Design an enzyme around this catalytic site. Structure first.
Site, short mmCIF file in Angstrom:
data_model
loop_
_atom_site.label_atom_id
_atom_site.label_comp_id
_atom_site.label_asym_id
_atom_site.label_seq_id
_atom_site.Cartn_x
_atom_site.Cartn_y
_atom_site.Cartn_z
N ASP A 68 38.37 85.75 37.61
CA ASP A 68 38.36 87.16 38.04
C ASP A 68 37.03 87.43 38.74
O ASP A 68 36.05 86.76 38.41
CB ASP A 68 38.50 88.10 36.84
CG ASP A 68 39.73 87.81 36.02
OD1 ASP A 68 40.83 88.16 36.49
OD2 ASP A 68 39.58 87.23 34.90
N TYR A 70 33.51 89.61 39.53
CA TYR A 70 32.48 90.36 38.78
C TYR A 70 33.01 91.76 38.49
O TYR A 70 33.47 92.46 39.37
CB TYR A 70 31.19 90.40 39.60
CG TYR A 70 30.46 89.08 39.78
CD1 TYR A 70 29.97 88.37 38.69
CD2 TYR A 70 30.22 88.58 41.05
CE1 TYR A 70 29.27 87.19 38.86
CE2 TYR A 70 29.52 87.40 41.23
CZ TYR A 70 29.03 86.70 40.13
OH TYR A 70 28.34 85.53 40.31
N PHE A 81 31.87 84.08 42.61
CA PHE A 81 30.48 83.91 42.11
C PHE A 81 29.40 84.47 43.04
O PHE A 81 28.29 84.74 42.52
CB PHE A 81 30.24 82.44 41.82
CG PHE A 81 31.18 81.94 40.76
CD1 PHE A 81 31.03 82.36 39.45
CD2 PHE A 81 32.25 81.12 41.08
CE1 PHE A 81 31.91 81.93 38.47
CE2 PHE A 81 33.12 80.68 40.10
CZ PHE A 81 32.94 81.07 38.79
N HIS A 191 35.49 70.20 32.71
CA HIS A 191 35.56 71.55 33.34
C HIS A 191 34.70 72.55 32.58
O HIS A 191 35.21 73.59 32.18
CB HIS A 191 37.03 72.02 33.38
CG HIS A 191 37.97 70.91 33.70
ND1 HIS A 191 37.96 70.30 34.93
CD2 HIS A 191 38.88 70.26 32.94
CE1 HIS A 191 38.85 69.33 34.93
NE2 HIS A 191 39.43 69.28 33.72
#
Length: 227
Positions: A68, A70, A81, A191
């Site tokens: 998702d 911020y 990001f 991951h």
């Protein structure tokens, strides 16, 4: 999304690639309008929601997947990001990503948190869900973005072209089948996500490993260097 047709909203390659989810994109545009009508807000700004699909689909060499945007106002800019150049301090996630950047590549701390240069060089900063209600993390899960970003990822994997995938939003057992039907796709394992920090993220060497894999598949490496 918006009221223009897919060819008007995103780059040529992406219009063709996302053709099968043209209707769903139209639905998400209608969803966002009806949120404003219902007195709720969304991030990022409408004009940034599909921003990741405005860099050439044929040029993408690396996929970086998040979950998702911020949830804090003025952070989300439609590349996973990334934040706008005047955002200070960076969010924890981006600060962690940039520590790994300096450790892995040896470069100095970037001047800001704008990741446009990565998107220009064929790094696809894709969130699985492309919008969020401000101050409410993961609020737009299950509203229809997942089918769009799934189609994006399956189409990227179906190219006769190299691809390295970095998973920074967990969801491995969801994402790994979408990427497995590809020809020249290498998936960075394991991951860790940026907030795993010293419990797996730091030292994961995602950038250098991406270039070694790219070069091994006969492709040019990514110039990761930010200003």
């Amino acid at each position: 999304m918006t009221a223009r047709p897919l060819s008007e909203l995103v780059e040529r390659g992406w219009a063709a690639a996302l053709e099968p989810v043209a209707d769903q994109v139209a639905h998400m545009g209608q969803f966002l309008r009806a949120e404003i009508a219902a007195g709720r807000r969304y991030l990022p700004a409408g004009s940034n929601v599909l921003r990741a699909f405005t860099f050439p689909f044929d040029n993408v060499r690396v996929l970086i997947v998040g979950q998702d945007p911020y949830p804090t106002p003025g952070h989300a800019v439609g590349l996973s990001f990334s934040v706008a150049p005047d955002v200070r301090p960076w969010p924890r996630s981006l600060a962690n990503i940039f520590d790994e950047y300096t450790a892995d590549l040896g470069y100095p701390l970037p001047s800001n948190g704008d990741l446009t240069p990565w998107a220009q060089r064929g790094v696809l900063l894709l969130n699985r869900v492309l919008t969020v209600r401000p101050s409410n993390p993961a609020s737009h899960r299950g509203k229809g973005w997942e089918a769009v970003t799934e189609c994006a990822i399956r189409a990227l994997a179906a190219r006769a072209a190299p691809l390295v995938a970095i998973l920074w939003g967990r969801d491995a057992s969801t994402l790994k089948p979408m990427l497995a039907a590809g020809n020249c796709v290498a998936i960075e394992s394991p991951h860790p996500s940026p907030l795993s920090a010293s419990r797996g993220f730091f030292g994961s060497r995602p950038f250098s490993r991406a270039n070694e894999l790219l070069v091994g598949m006969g492709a040019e490496p990514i110039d990761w260097r930010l200003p």
